[PDB]
């Protein structure tokens, strides 16, 4: 197998019968994927009469009292039925009638089960004078298409004489004054202005299986969010309903929203904004791929595009999805945070790695507002927290709140800490200063581990001691040394004890010069 040798023989033809245009709300007679068909696999060489024959036979009439309109596509999109002649044409094969269609759709016109009582004979047909029309009826109050069948007419009457059989299908008296509108195609739906008019003359392009709108002209449909069918198919065309999922909880089946094609974001988030009793500003949407399935990029609230423009990824099979998640500050705000990544240095003085999101426009206080938040402070101790630039393991600076994090260096040689400042630290005086300080292997470039602030003079071997106890070691050796331009000189750490050595001898005030830890790894 699988595929059979003869399979190729057989084409597949999809009778409809008119019972299934009924309740249809659409444009056109059904809507293709919810139209149940009765389906024939048919030799393709085959003839029409065969197949009218055996037609006749499976579906239990005679076939003097069916007939077969094709439906058949037009330029514009549509697919309507369409004149086949059942004795002119029933010599040719299959194929041939189809144009090599297949599938083949094909309506099927029986008789009124009730009349077909009698032996009632379907109606004689001319293919050039005569016109099959539908019939739909527009009701406003319910917003809604009611089917009301189809007429053979000669195409010179006049649409006037038409009106009581639309009266008498929809369920109206006589004297009812009726708004008559052609179904051209999706958003087309063309008033008849003029009923004393023949049909030939009152319709561009008379057709079989043109199809004839109306309506009451009824003072209360004014009263319908839709009152007339064009405005009815108007909306239709547009109309697209969208299942909306949050982006915080996968496999989130979400919620369908009815919207329009033509809304703009303000509109849509609007609208999703209720269904959930939250603000439309407390909402972020995300574009689309549709196949690929998102969310993909957050879709700005500046946005200036159409919901069309959103689902336009979209082939009309999928069902359209777009993704949404809720916010905490206003849709602006969120937008303008700016990510920054650093490094935490906990009250335990270890590294972890944080991203802040704080203003775009936020200077260093607000970085620093935005840490404390995340980070227990450890405890009894000072509650402040400090900014320090960082490259090659060395405190190259620490900066001022007043600072905008506008200024600071992009570059990722540089490396921002925030950390809490020691008690010590803050009620320091002339006998007191800050130093900077890191380790280093060997030669003073070498610098490694974690650079740190210290209180700078008339000692050492307990400086020695206090930054044993910070750095908590166990360190017998490493030496000692100021670290200046071009210069380092180690220190004695059994007689040597300072001043404010450290600071620039005057000839340039940066670099400050610093205390450097000298031992392995």
Known sequence: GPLGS????????????????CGHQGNDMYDEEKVKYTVFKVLKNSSLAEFVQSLSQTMGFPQDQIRLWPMQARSNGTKRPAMLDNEADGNKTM???????????????????????????????????????????????????????????????????????????????????????????????????????????????????????????????????????????????????????????????????????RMNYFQVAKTVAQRLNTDPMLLQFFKSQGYRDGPGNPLRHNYEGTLRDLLQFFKPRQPKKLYYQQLKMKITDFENRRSFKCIWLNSQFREEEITLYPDKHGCVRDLLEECKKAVEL????????????????????????????????????????????????????????????????????????????????????????????????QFEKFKFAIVMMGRHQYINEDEYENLKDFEPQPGMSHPRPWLGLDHFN
């Open 6 to 21: 003869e399979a190729h023989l057989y084409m597949q033809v999809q009778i409809v019968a008119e019972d299934q245009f």
């Open 95 to 261: 194929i041939e009638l189809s144009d090599n269609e297949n599938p083949w759709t094909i309506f099927l016109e029986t008789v009124d089960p009730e009349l077909a009582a009698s032996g009632a004979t379907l109606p004689k047909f001319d293919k050039d004078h005569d016109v099959m029309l539908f019939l739909k009826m527009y009701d406003p109050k319910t917003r809604s298409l009611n089917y009301c069948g189809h007429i053979y007419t000669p195409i010179s009457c006049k649409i006037r004489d038409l009106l009581p059989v639309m009266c008498d299908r929809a369920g109206f008296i006589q004297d009812t004054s009726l708004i008559l509108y052609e179904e051209v195609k999706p958003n087309l739906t063309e008033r008849i202005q003029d009923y004393d008019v023949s049909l030939d003359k009152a319709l561009d392009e008379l057709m079989d299986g043109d199809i004839i709108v109306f309506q009451k002209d009824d003072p209360e449909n004014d009263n319908s969010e839709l009152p007339t069918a064009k405005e009815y198919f108007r909306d239709l065309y547009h109309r697209v309903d969208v299942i909306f999922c949050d982006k915080t909880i996968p496999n989130d089946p979400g919620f369908v929203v009815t919207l329009s094609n």
């Open 378 to 473: 450890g405890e009894k101790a000072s509650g402040k927290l400090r900014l320090l630039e960082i490259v090659s393991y060395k405190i190259i600076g620490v900066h001022q709140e007043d600072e905008l994090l506008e200024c600071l260096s992009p570059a990722t040689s540089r490396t921002f800490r925030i950390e809490e400042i020691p008690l010590d630290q803050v009620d320091i005086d002339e006998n007191e200063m800050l130093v900077t300080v890191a380790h280093f292997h060997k030669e003073v470039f070498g610098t490694f581990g974690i650079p740190f602030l210290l209180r700078i003079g008339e000692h050492f071997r307990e400086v020695m001691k206090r930054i044993q106890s910070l750095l908590d070691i």
